[PDB]
Structure formats: C-alpha cells, structure tokens
Amino acid sequence: IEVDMANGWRGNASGSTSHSGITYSADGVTFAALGDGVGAVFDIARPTTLEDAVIAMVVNVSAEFKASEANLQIFAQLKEDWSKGEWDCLAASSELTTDLTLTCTIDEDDDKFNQTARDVQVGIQAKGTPAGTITIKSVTITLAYSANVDHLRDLAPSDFPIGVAVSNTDSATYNLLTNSREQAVVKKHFNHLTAGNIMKMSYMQPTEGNFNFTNADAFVDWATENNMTVHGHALVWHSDYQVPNFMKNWAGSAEDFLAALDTHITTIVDHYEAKGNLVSWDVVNAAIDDNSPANFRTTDSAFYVKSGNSSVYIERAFQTARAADPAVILYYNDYNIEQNNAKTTKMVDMVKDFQARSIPIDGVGFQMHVCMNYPSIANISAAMKKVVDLGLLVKITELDVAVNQPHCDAYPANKINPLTEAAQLAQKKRYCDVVKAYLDTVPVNQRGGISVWGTTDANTWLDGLYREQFEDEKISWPLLFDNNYNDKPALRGFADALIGTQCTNTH
Numbered sequence: 001i002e003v004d005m006a007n008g009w010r011g012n013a014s015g016s017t018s019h020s021g022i023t024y025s026a027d028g029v030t031f032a033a034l035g036d037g038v039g040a041v042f043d044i045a046r047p048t049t050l051e052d053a054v055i056a057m058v059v060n061v062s063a064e065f066k067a068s069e070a071n072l073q074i075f076a077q078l079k080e081d082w083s084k085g086e087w088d089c090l091a092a093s094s095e096l097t098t099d100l101t102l103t104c105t106i107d108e109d110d111d112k113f114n115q116t117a118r119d120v121q122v123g124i125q126a127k128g129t130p131a132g133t134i135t136i137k138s139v140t141i142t143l144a145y146s147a148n149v150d151h152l153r154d155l156a157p158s159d160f161p162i163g164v165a166v167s168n169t170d171s172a173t174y175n176l177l178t179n180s181r182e183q184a185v186v187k188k189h190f191n192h193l194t195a196g197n198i199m200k201m202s203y204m205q206p207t208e209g210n211f212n213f214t215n216a217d218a219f220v221d222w223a224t225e226n227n228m229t230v231h232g233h234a235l236v237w238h239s240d241y242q243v244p245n246f247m248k249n250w251a252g253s254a255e256d257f258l259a260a261l262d263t264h265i266t267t268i269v270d271h272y273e274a275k276g277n278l279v280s281w282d283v284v285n286a287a288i289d290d291n292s293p294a295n296f297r298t299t300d301s302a303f304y305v306k307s308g309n310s311s312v313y314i315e316r317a318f319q320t321a322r323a324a325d326p327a328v329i330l331y332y333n334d335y336n337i338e339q340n341n342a343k344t345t346k347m348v349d350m351v352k353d354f355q356a357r358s359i360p361i362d363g364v365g366f367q368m369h370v371c372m373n374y375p376s377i378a379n380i381s382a383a384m385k386k387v388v389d390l391g392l393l394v395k396i397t398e399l400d401v402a403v404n405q406p407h408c409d410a411y412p413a414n415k416i417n418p419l420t421e422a423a424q425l426a427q428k429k430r431y432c433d434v435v436k437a438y439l440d441t442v443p444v445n446q447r448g449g450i451s452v453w454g455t456t457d458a459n460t461w462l463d464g465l466y467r468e469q470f471e472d473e474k475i476s477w478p479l480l481f482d483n484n485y486n487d488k489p490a491l492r493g494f495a496d497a498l499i500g501t502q503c504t505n506t507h
C-alpha cells in the first residue's frame with residue numbers, strides 16, 4: 001500500500017492539548033507539534049488484516065522540534081474502540097536530525113488488527129514537551145499455508161522422475177547455482193532437472209566449431225552431486241533468439257548445412273554422454289506450425305529454409321543423435337499437441353511415418369502449457385493415448401497452469417486480479433486432474449516422467465510472454481510455490497494425484 005500524501009489526512013489530538021490540523025505541499029504532509037499526543041493521521045476501511053504489517057514513514061523535522069528533545073511515536077488504533085491499538089513503537093529524539101526512514105511493525109498479543117468491526121486510524125504523534133513542525137514525505141505499509149508434503153518425488157506410485165526446469169547463468173537473480181532459496185526447494189522435492197535456456201543452440205555453439213560447455217557442465221555437476229538426472233533441452237529449435245548466427249546466415253549448399261547440423265548434434269550428445277548424467281534429449285523441439293490443418297514450419301524456421309525448403313532435417317537429427325549415443329532416450333517435444341485437434345494429428349502422422357521408414361524415435365514430450373479449464377481432461381487423455389498405442393514413452397516436460405491467459409476464459413472479461421483463495425483451489429483441482437490423467441492413461445513402462453516449468457511464481461516465463469496483454473502485471477501465478485517460495489494448494493493437488501486421493505477444489 002502506497003499511502004496518498006495529497007488527500008485523506010487529518011490533524012489529531014490523542015491527549016488534552018488541541019491540534020492545529022495538517023498542511024499539504026510538494027514536500028508531503030506537515031503539522032505543528034503543539035503538545036503531547038498531537039499528530040497527523042489517515043484511515044483504512046474495515047475489514048483489516050494488519051497483524052505483522054510494517055508501516056514505513058519518511059519524515060523531516062524542523063530545528064525547533066529537534067531542540068525540544070521530543071520523541072516521535074508511529075501508531076495505529078481502532079475507531080470507536082480508541083483504547084485498542086499498536087502503542088509500542090517509539091523513535092527517541094536521540095535518533096533524529098535530513099529525511100529519515102522510521103518504521104513500526106504492527107505486532108499485537110491478541111491479533112486485534114485482524115478484525116471486521118471498525119475502521120483503522122493510522123499516524124504519527126509527538127510525545128513529551130514538543131515544539132516546531134513535522135513533515136511526512138511518504139508512507140508505505142507492507143502487509144502461511146503448508147501442503148504438508150515432505151518430498152514430492154517420493155510419492156510417485158511407480159519408477160518415473162518428478163522434475164523441474166531451473167534458471168542458470170541466463171538469470172542474475174534466479175540462477176540455481178547462486179540462489180540458495182532455489183537450491184533448497186529443488187533439493188527438497190525433485191529428482192530430475194531441465195536447463196531452461198543454457199543447453200539451447202547458440203548457448204552451446206555460439207560460433208562455428210567453438211563449443212561452450214563451461215556453464216552447462218557446472219549445472220550437470222551440481223545435478224550429479226545431488227543425485228538427480230538431467231533431461232537435455234534442446235538439440236534443434238527454430239526460435240530466433242537461440243539459433244546460432246552462422247546457421248541463420250548460412251550461404252553454402254543444403255548438403256553442407258545439413259552436415260553442419262550433424263556436427264552440432266554429434267559433438268554435444270557425445271560430450272554429455274561422456275559427462276555421465278544425461279538420460280534423455282528433446283532432439284527436435286516444436287517444429288510443427290499452429291495452423292489447422294497443421295504442417296511442418298516453413299519460412300519461420302532457418303532449418304526448413306537452409307536445408308533447401310525441406311523438413312528432412314527432422315528425421316536426420318534423430319538418426320544422428322542415435323548414432324552418437326545409442327543408449328540415450330530420444331524425444332520429439334511440442335506444445336498444443338495435448339488439445340487433440342490439428343496439431344495432435346500432424347504429430348501422430350509424423351510418428352507413424354518415422355516408424356514406417358525406420359527413423360529412430362523413443363517418445364513424445366507433451367509440454368502441457370495448459371489453461372485452468374482448457375483443454376478438457378477427455379481430450380488430453382485421448383491425445384496421450386494415441387502415442388501410448390504406438391508403443392512409445394509419454395513424458396510431461398513443461399507443466400504449468402495459468403490463472404489468467406489471454407487465449408482462455410474470454411480474457412480479459414473475467415480477469416482475476418488480485419489472486420483469490422478460490423483461484424488457488426481451482427488450481428489445486430486442475431493440477432490434480434492433469435497428473436491423474438497421466439497415471440490413468442500411460443502404462444507403468446511407458447511413463448517418461450512429469451516435470452514443471454519453473455519453481456516460484458516470481459520467475460515464470462508466462463508473465464514475460466504475455467506482458468502486453470497483462471499490461472506488465474505478473475498475473476499468471478502458474479506454479480507450485482509462491483513469490484516467497486512457500487507452498488501453494490497446487491502442490492497439495494499434484495501430491496493428491498500421486499497418492500490416488502480424489503481430485504477436488506475444497507480443503
């Protein structure tokens with residue numbers, strides 16, 4: 001709460017000496033400190049949840065007030081219940097001179113400031129034998145749950161990994177290796193990791209024949225130290241920000257381009273085989289378009305264009321990855337293929353073609369970037385079953401569940417902001433439904449794992465993707481842990497599914 005400094009302020013006398021009101025300017029709110037108990041205040045409407053809230057004021061006091069040796073008391077009290085309040089803050093003349101920052105934590109014995117009955121009067125007053133003036137420049141007021149899950153990974157009903165995507169050197173704030181809160185949540189709940197960006201193409205090979213393994217190797221070493229396996233992401237992907245410059249600008253033949261693509265794959269696969277912890281790769285990521293009917297991408301993919309207007313690079317990537325390490329599990333990975341419409345159909349036809357022509361492929365990764373109420377559990381189940389029936393592994397690679405999403409629930413007509421308890425419980429049921437559909441649809445020996453695309457809501461990729469539609473607000477809140485790394489009901493819902501407990505949006 002940033003308190004308005006231009007409206008809503010009042011003089012106050014909490015003692016016998018009368019006050020002389022308040023004065024507005026460009027510097028803030030000013031009053032004369034006429035006697036003991038004389039101050040300035042504003043109101044907060046009922047109901048209030050103000051226990052453990054922190055009041056911070058920037059103030060500025062006159063020479064005469066300094067000379068008076070008077071103290072300053074930040075306080076709050078209930079209107080019509082005047083005797084009840086927070087009276088234990090005091091800034092003594094000692095500490096005063098400049099704009100100072102004075103704070104007051106609202107901390108009461110009986111929880112009196114979590115209440116429904118009265119409005120709340122908040123302010124600052126002089127104590128002692130005061131004189132001169134006080135100026136307040138600004139006021140800010142900084143206002144748990146447990147899922148009771150000890151280790152999420154330990155609840156899987158068969159042997160499949162429970163995994164998470166982490167940030168690395170691509171984020172100063174959220175880098176797994178420098179952020180001890182990220183390390184803690186990961187070590188507590190997961191046994192499987194994906195790098196969010198640093199194993200993508202231009203990160204691994206920024207120029208032709210100069211590979212850069214240093215940062216990704218430190219990530220793999222930390223996974224090994226902590227008894228976790230690594231899913232490699234990704235050997236081939238069209239997204240412009242991570243295509244190596246020399247590939248974007250290829251000026252030679254189609255056969256020479258495909259040979260350079262082979263070198264990229266063989267070098268990276270051989271290196272991570274020898275490092276000793278790399279169990280599966282997304283070999284080709286998101287190569288099908290978003291049209292209906294669906295086709296492989298054309299002009300928006302450097303790989304289609306530089307291969308000579310051909311999708312042959314897809315099968316070649318799989319053949320090359322297999323030759324480099326025959327033991328590593330090979331996935332095709334994509335979004336929207338869980339919807340059971342045009343894109344699902346194109347993916348299934350591609351797998352059938354590959355099986356007919358002896359092109360190696362071990363599984364399909366369903367990224368599973370879903371909305372709260374779309375697509376349906378029936379459609380998600382039917383789409384995964386199409387892959388199960390071809391004898392392949394099914395892996396959920398990038399699960400998140402958006403509370404607001406511009407393509408769902410007629411956004412923004414029903415926008416949820418701020419986040420509510422009802423929305424958190426809806427998210428609990430939704431994570432339960434999706435994980436249960438996976439277990440119900442995919443036989444034990446075809447379960448490639450379930451991973452979520454991030455740790456805390458404070459760093460989800462969705463808020464950046466939809467920044468324009470969201471008006472720069474962080475409103476997708478799509479993951480298992482909140483902005484302070486505490487549990488959300490979402491985590492209880494994931495756990496309920498693993499243990500076979502009914503999926504609900506209740507407590």
Ligand SMILES: O[C@@H]1[C@@H](O)[C@H](O[C@@H]2CO[C@@H](O[C@@H]3CO[C@@H](O[C@@H]4CO[C@@H](O)[C@H](O)[C@H]4O)[C@H](O)[C@H]3O)[C@H](O)[C@H]2O)OC[C@H]1O
Pocket residue numbers: 012013014015077082083087121
């Ligand atoms: O250290 C604590 C003491 O400060 C504390 O004294 C209390 C201070 O607050 C007092 O409440 C006064 C009551 O008058 C209010 O103004 C009235 C608002 O309504 C108008 O209709 C009316 O005309 C005004 O006069 C004022 O806002 C408010 O500060 C309270 O009565 C004192 O008990 O005691 C506890 C110590 O720990």
Ligand SMILES: O[C@@H]1[C@@H](O)[C@H](O[C@@H]2CO[C@@H](O[C@@H]3CO[C@@H](O[C@@H]4CO[C@@H](O)[C@H](O)[C@H]4O)[C@H](O)[C@H]3O)[C@H](O)[C@H]2O)OC[C@H]1O
Pocket residue numbers: 196197241285286335367461
């Ligand atoms: O020089 C800096 C640039 O490098 C930097 O680039 C940004 C890097 O982050 C990018 O966002 C990435 C995009 O990929 C996300 O994961 C994908 C989600 O969709 C799935 O289909 C796919 O499989 C996943 O790989 C990832 O979470 C997210 O962090 C962003 O788009 C780039 O612009 O910009 C800052 C410069 O200083």
